[PDB]
Amino acid sequence: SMQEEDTFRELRIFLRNVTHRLAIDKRFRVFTKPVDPDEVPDYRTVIKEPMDLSSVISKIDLHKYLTVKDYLRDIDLICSNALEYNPDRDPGDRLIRHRACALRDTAYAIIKEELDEDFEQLCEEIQESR
Ligand SMILES: CC(=O)N1C[C@@H]2C[C@@H]3O[C@]2(Cc2[nH]cnc23)C1
């Protein structure tokens, strides 16, 4: 229905605003673009599904996310990729792990405060019906 397409357009507006607020935070700069194959030629042999905040905005605009749950699966993949690729005790690895955990926790906290649980349940019920 037209009302259902208005629901999904409100979901996209909401996801673009959360994603912009993560992308401007100086802590999260390392997550704003794909890892450069040139600088790190080993990255794509270890990490089988790379993800970054620029790809997330592209995916919103391609209508890839019909629920906030499917968006959070990509935020979780950015964070789990960084924990798996940078697991060592040295300060460089520990700093990127601390930033990855802060990106995940910040996204979840904005969604807990600003997403209406009945808006998310409506998106889930339209998705299930298709
Ligand atoms: C997001 C992530 O997990 N990354 C690991 C890489 C290792 C290190 O920070 C890089 C990018 C880079 N270029 C040169 N050294 C590096 C980003």
Side-chain angles (χ1 to χ4, degrees), residues 78-92:
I78 298 172
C79 178
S80 66
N81 288 344
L83 304 183
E84 286 158 15
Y85 191 74
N86 307 279
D88 294 349
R89 73 100 29 212
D90 60 279

mmCIF file with all atom_site columns, all heavy atoms in Angstrom, residues 78-92:
data_model
loop_
_atom_site.group_PDB
_atom_site.id
_atom_site.type_symbol
_atom_site.label_atom_id
_atom_site.label_alt_id
_atom_site.label_comp_id
_atom_site.label_asym_id
_atom_site.label_entity_id
_atom_site.label_seq_id
_atom_site.pdbx_PDB_ins_code
_atom_site.Cartn_x
_atom_site.Cartn_y
_atom_site.Cartn_z
_atom_site.occupancy
_atom_site.B_iso_or_equiv
_atom_site.pdbx_formal_charge
_atom_site.auth_seq_id
_atom_site.auth_comp_id
_atom_site.auth_asym_id
_atom_site.auth_atom_id
_atom_site.pdbx_PDB_model_num
ATOM 1   N N   . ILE A 1 78 ? 30.567 -4.370  11.122 1.00 0.00 ? 78 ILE A N   1
ATOM 2   C CA  . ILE A 1 78 ? 31.720 -3.417  11.188 1.00 0.00 ? 78 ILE A CA  1
ATOM 3   C C   . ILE A 1 78 ? 32.530 -3.716  12.468 1.00 0.00 ? 78 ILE A C   1
ATOM 4   O O   . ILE A 1 78 ? 33.821 -3.769  12.429 1.00 0.00 ? 78 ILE A O   1
ATOM 5   C CB  . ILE A 1 78 ? 31.266 -1.945  11.153 1.00 0.00 ? 78 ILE A CB  1
ATOM 6   C CG1 . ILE A 1 78 ? 30.547 -1.618  9.848  1.00 0.00 ? 78 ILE A CG1 1
ATOM 7   C CG2 . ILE A 1 78 ? 32.472 -1.007  11.351 1.00 0.00 ? 78 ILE A CG2 1
ATOM 8   C CD1 . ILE A 1 78 ? 29.893 -0.243  9.808  1.00 0.00 ? 78 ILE A CD1 1
ATOM 9   N N   . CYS A 1 79 ? 31.878 -3.843  13.608 1.00 0.00 ? 79 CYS A N   1
ATOM 10  C CA  . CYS A 1 79 ? 32.493 -4.015  14.953 1.00 0.00 ? 79 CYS A CA  1
ATOM 11  C C   . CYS A 1 79 ? 33.170 -5.409  15.022 1.00 0.00 ? 79 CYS A C   1
ATOM 12  O O   . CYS A 1 79 ? 34.373 -5.486  15.326 1.00 0.00 ? 79 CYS A O   1
ATOM 13  C CB  . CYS A 1 79 ? 31.492 -3.875  16.072 1.00 0.00 ? 79 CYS A CB  1
ATOM 14  S SG  . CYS A 1 79 ? 32.213 -4.147  17.716 1.00 0.00 ? 79 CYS A SG  1
ATOM 15  N N   . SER A 1 80 ? 32.495 -6.502  14.641 1.00 0.00 ? 80 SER A N   1
ATOM 16  C CA  . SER A 1 80 ? 33.083 -7.864  14.741 1.00 0.00 ? 80 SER A CA  1
ATOM 17  C C   . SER A 1 80 ? 34.297 -7.991  13.776 1.00 0.00 ? 80 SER A C   1
ATOM 18  O O   . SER A 1 80 ? 35.345 -8.650  14.147 1.00 0.00 ? 80 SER A O   1
ATOM 19  C CB  . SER A 1 80 ? 32.004 -8.943  14.556 1.00 0.00 ? 80 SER A CB  1
ATOM 20  O OG  . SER A 1 80 ? 31.478 -8.933  13.254 1.00 0.00 ? 80 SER A OG  1
ATOM 21  N N   . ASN A 1 81 ? 34.270 -7.425  12.583 1.00 0.00 ? 81 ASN A N   1
ATOM 22  C CA  . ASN A 1 81 ? 35.391 -7.415  11.620 1.00 0.00 ? 81 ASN A CA  1
ATOM 23  C C   . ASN A 1 81 ? 36.627 -6.791  12.319 1.00 0.00 ? 81 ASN A C   1
ATOM 24  O O   . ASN A 1 81 ? 37.760 -7.314  12.208 1.00 0.00 ? 81 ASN A O   1
ATOM 25  C CB  . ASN A 1 81 ? 35.085 -6.724  10.306 1.00 0.00 ? 81 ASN A CB  1
ATOM 26  C CG  . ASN A 1 81 ? 34.133 -7.492  9.383  1.00 0.00 ? 81 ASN A CG  1
ATOM 27  O OD1 . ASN A 1 81 ? 33.909 -8.688  9.579  1.00 0.00 ? 81 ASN A OD1 1
ATOM 28  N ND2 . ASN A 1 81 ? 33.643 -6.836  8.338  1.00 0.00 ? 81 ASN A ND2 1
ATOM 29  N N   . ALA A 1 82 ? 36.467 -5.638  12.962 1.00 0.00 ? 82 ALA A N   1
ATOM 30  C CA  . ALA A 1 82 ? 37.625 -4.959  13.606 1.00 0.00 ? 82 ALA A CA  1
ATOM 31  C C   . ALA A 1 82 ? 38.146 -5.800  14.783 1.00 0.00 ? 82 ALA A C   1
ATOM 32  O O   . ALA A 1 82 ? 39.387 -5.835  14.983 1.00 0.00 ? 82 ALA A O   1
ATOM 33  C CB  . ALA A 1 82 ? 37.170 -3.573  14.052 1.00 0.00 ? 82 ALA A CB  1
ATOM 34  N N   . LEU A 1 83 ? 37.304 -6.443  15.577 1.00 0.00 ? 83 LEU A N   1
ATOM 35  C CA  . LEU A 1 83 ? 37.766 -7.274  16.720 1.00 0.00 ? 83 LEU A CA  1
ATOM 36  C C   . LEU A 1 83 ? 38.551 -8.494  16.197 1.00 0.00 ? 83 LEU A C   1
ATOM 37  O O   . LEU A 1 83 ? 39.565 -8.877  16.812 1.00 0.00 ? 83 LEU A O   1
ATOM 38  C CB  . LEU A 1 83 ? 36.633 -7.719  17.611 1.00 0.00 ? 83 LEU A CB  1
ATOM 39  C CG  . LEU A 1 83 ? 35.724 -6.630  18.212 1.00 0.00 ? 83 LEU A CG  1
ATOM 40  C CD1 . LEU A 1 83 ? 34.689 -7.258  19.132 1.00 0.00 ? 83 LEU A CD1 1
ATOM 41  C CD2 . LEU A 1 83 ? 36.498 -5.579  18.957 1.00 0.00 ? 83 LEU A CD2 1
ATOM 42  N N   . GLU A 1 84 ? 38.128 -9.061  15.068 1.00 0.00 ? 84 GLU A N   1
ATOM 43  C CA  . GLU A 1 84 ? 38.746 -10.301 14.517 1.00 0.00 ? 84 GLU A CA  1
ATOM 44  C C   . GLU A 1 84 ? 40.057 -9.949  13.801 1.00 0.00 ? 84 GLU A C   1
ATOM 45  O O   . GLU A 1 84 ? 41.021 -10.723 13.940 1.00 0.00 ? 84 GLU A O   1
ATOM 46  C CB  . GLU A 1 84 ? 37.734 -11.022 13.618 1.00 0.00 ? 84 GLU A CB  1
ATOM 47  C CG  . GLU A 1 84 ? 36.637 -11.720 14.401 1.00 0.00 ? 84 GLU A CG  1
ATOM 48  C CD  . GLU A 1 84 ? 35.345 -12.002 13.634 1.00 0.00 ? 84 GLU A CD  1
ATOM 49  O OE1 . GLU A 1 84 ? 35.365 -11.920 12.398 1.00 0.00 ? 84 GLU A OE1 1
ATOM 50  O OE2 . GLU A 1 84 ? 34.316 -12.297 14.291 1.00 0.00 ? 84 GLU A OE2 1
ATOM 51  N N   . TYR A 1 85 ? 40.117 -8.850  13.055 1.00 0.00 ? 85 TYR A N   1
ATOM 52  C CA  . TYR A 1 85 ? 41.324 -8.491  12.296 1.00 0.00 ? 85 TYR A CA  1
ATOM 53  C C   . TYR A 1 85 ? 42.429 -7.923  13.222 1.00 0.00 ? 85 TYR A C   1
ATOM 54  O O   . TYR A 1 85 ? 43.638 -8.034  12.817 1.00 0.00 ? 85 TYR A O   1
ATOM 55  C CB  . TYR A 1 85 ? 41.051 -7.539  11.140 1.00 0.00 ? 85 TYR A CB  1
ATOM 56  C CG  . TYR A 1 85 ? 42.236 -7.386  10.212 1.00 0.00 ? 85 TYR A CG  1
ATOM 57  C CD1 . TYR A 1 85 ? 42.586 -8.415  9.334  1.00 0.00 ? 85 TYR A CD1 1
ATOM 58  C CD2 . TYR A 1 85 ? 43.050 -6.274  10.252 1.00 0.00 ? 85 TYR A CD2 1
ATOM 59  C CE1 . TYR A 1 85 ? 43.700 -8.299  8.505  1.00 0.00 ? 85 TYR A CE1 1
ATOM 60  C CE2 . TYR A 1 85 ? 44.173 -6.149  9.446  1.00 0.00 ? 85 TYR A CE2 1
ATOM 61  C CZ  . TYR A 1 85 ? 44.509 -7.179  8.579  1.00 0.00 ? 85 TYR A CZ  1
ATOM 62  O OH  . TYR A 1 85 ? 45.582 -7.078  7.734  1.00 0.00 ? 85 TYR A OH  1
ATOM 63  N N   . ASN A 1 86 ? 42.067 -7.337  14.356 1.00 0.00 ? 86 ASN A N   1
ATOM 64  C CA  . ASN A 1 86 ? 43.062 -6.588  15.208 1.00 0.00 ? 86 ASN A CA  1
ATOM 65  C C   . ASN A 1 86 ? 43.046 -7.134  16.624 1.00 0.00 ? 86 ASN A C   1
ATOM 66  O O   . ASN A 1 86 ? 42.606 -6.455  17.569 1.00 0.00 ? 86 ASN A O   1
ATOM 67  C CB  . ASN A 1 86 ? 42.760 -5.083  15.172 1.00 0.00 ? 86 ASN A CB  1
ATOM 68  C CG  . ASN A 1 86 ? 42.659 -4.456  13.796 1.00 0.00 ? 86 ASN A CG  1
ATOM 69  O OD1 . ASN A 1 86 ? 43.648 -4.120  13.139 1.00 0.00 ? 86 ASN A OD1 1
ATOM 70  N ND2 . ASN A 1 86 ? 41.417 -4.292  13.301 1.00 0.00 ? 86 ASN A ND2 1
ATOM 71  N N   . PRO A 1 87 ? 43.411 -8.419  16.867 1.00 0.00 ? 87 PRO A N   1
ATOM 72  C CA  . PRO A 1 87 ? 43.200 -9.062  18.156 1.00 0.00 ? 87 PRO A CA  1
ATOM 73  C C   . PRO A 1 87 ? 44.340 -8.997  19.202 1.00 0.00 ? 87 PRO A C   1
ATOM 74  O O   . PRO A 1 87 ? 44.123 -9.560  20.279 1.00 0.00 ? 87 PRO A O   1
ATOM 75  C CB  . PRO A 1 87 ? 43.076 -10.545 17.764 1.00 0.00 ? 87 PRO A CB  1
ATOM 76  C CG  . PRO A 1 87 ? 44.017 -10.653 16.635 1.00 0.00 ? 87 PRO A CG  1
ATOM 77  C CD  . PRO A 1 87 ? 43.924 -9.367  15.871 1.00 0.00 ? 87 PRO A CD  1
ATOM 78  N N   . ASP A 1 88 ? 45.430 -8.332  18.872 1.00 0.00 ? 88 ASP A N   1
ATOM 79  C CA  . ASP A 1 88 ? 46.706 -8.389  19.650 1.00 0.00 ? 88 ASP A CA  1
ATOM 80  C C   . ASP A 1 88 ? 46.727 -7.452  20.867 1.00 0.00 ? 88 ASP A C   1
ATOM 81  O O   . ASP A 1 88 ? 45.805 -6.570  21.002 1.00 0.00 ? 88 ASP A O   1
ATOM 82  C CB  . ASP A 1 88 ? 47.882 -8.177  18.701 1.00 0.00 ? 88 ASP A CB  1
ATOM 83  C CG  . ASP A 1 88 ? 48.101 -9.278  17.657 1.00 0.00 ? 88 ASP A CG  1
ATOM 84  O OD1 . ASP A 1 88 ? 47.462 -10.394 17.755 1.00 0.00 ? 88 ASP A OD1 1
ATOM 85  O OD2 . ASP A 1 88 ? 48.903 -9.013  16.754 1.00 0.00 ? 88 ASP A OD2 1
ATOM 86  N N   . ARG A 1 89 ? 47.787 -7.571  21.715 1.00 0.00 ? 89 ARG A N   1
ATOM 87  C CA  . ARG A 1 89 ? 47.858 -6.799  22.982 1.00 0.00 ? 89 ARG A CA  1
ATOM 88  C C   . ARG A 1 89 ? 48.439 -5.403  22.716 1.00 0.00 ? 89 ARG A C   1
ATOM 89  O O   . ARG A 1 89 ? 48.433 -4.569  23.629 1.00 0.00 ? 89 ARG A O   1
ATOM 90  C CB  . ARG A 1 89 ? 48.619 -7.531  24.106 1.00 0.00 ? 89 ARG A CB  1
ATOM 91  C CG  . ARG A 1 89 ? 50.142 -7.620  23.959 1.00 0.00 ? 89 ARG A CG  1
ATOM 92  C CD  . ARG A 1 89 ? 50.984 -6.611  24.777 1.00 0.00 ? 89 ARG A CD  1
ATOM 93  N NE  . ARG A 1 89 ? 50.439 -6.102  26.047 1.00 0.00 ? 89 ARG A NE  1
ATOM 94  C CZ  . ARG A 1 89 ? 50.697 -4.827  26.529 1.00 0.00 ? 89 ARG A CZ  1
ATOM 95  N NH1 . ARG A 1 89 ? 51.454 -4.031  25.780 1.00 0.00 ? 89 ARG A NH1 1
ATOM 96  N NH2 . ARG A 1 89 ? 50.231 -4.415  27.719 1.00 0.00 ? 89 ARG A NH2 1
ATOM 97  N N   . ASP A 1 90 ? 48.984 -5.149  21.569 1.00 0.00 ? 90 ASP A N   1
ATOM 98  C CA  . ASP A 1 90 ? 49.712 -3.893  21.419 1.00 0.00 ? 90 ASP A CA  1
ATOM 99  C C   . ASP A 1 90 ? 48.710 -2.733  21.331 1.00 0.00 ? 90 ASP A C   1
ATOM 100 O O   . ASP A 1 90 ? 47.507 -2.910  21.021 1.00 0.00 ? 90 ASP A O   1
ATOM 101 C CB  . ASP A 1 90 ? 50.588 -3.849  20.195 1.00 0.00 ? 90 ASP A CB  1
ATOM 102 C CG  . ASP A 1 90 ? 49.791 -4.034  18.934 1.00 0.00 ? 90 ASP A CG  1
ATOM 103 O OD1 . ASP A 1 90 ? 49.518 -5.199  18.655 1.00 0.00 ? 90 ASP A OD1 1
ATOM 104 O OD2 . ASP A 1 90 ? 49.402 -3.007  18.299 1.00 0.00 ? 90 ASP A OD2 1
ATOM 105 N N   . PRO A 1 91 ? 49.200 -1.520  21.620 1.00 0.00 ? 91 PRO A N   1
ATOM 106 C CA  . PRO A 1 91 ? 48.313 -0.367  21.716 1.00 0.00 ? 91 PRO A CA  1
ATOM 107 C C   . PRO A 1 91 ? 47.500 -0.039  20.453 1.00 0.00 ? 91 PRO A C   1
ATOM 108 O O   . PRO A 1 91 ? 46.377 0.450   20.601 1.00 0.00 ? 91 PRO A O   1
ATOM 109 C CB  . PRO A 1 91 ? 49.250 0.817   22.063 1.00 0.00 ? 91 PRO A CB  1
ATOM 110 C CG  . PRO A 1 91 ? 50.434 0.138   22.724 1.00 0.00 ? 91 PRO A CG  1
ATOM 111 C CD  . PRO A 1 91 ? 50.603 -1.187  22.006 1.00 0.00 ? 91 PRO A CD  1
ATOM 112 N N   . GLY A 1 92 ? 48.060 -0.218  19.266 1.00 0.00 ? 92 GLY A N   1
ATOM 113 C CA  . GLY A 1 92 ? 47.313 0.077   18.030 1.00 0.00 ? 92 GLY A CA  1
ATOM 114 C C   . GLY A 1 92 ? 46.076 -0.807  17.914 1.00 0.00 ? 92 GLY A C   1
ATOM 115 O O   . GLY A 1 92 ? 44.950 -0.290  17.602 1.00 0.00 ? 92 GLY A O   1
#
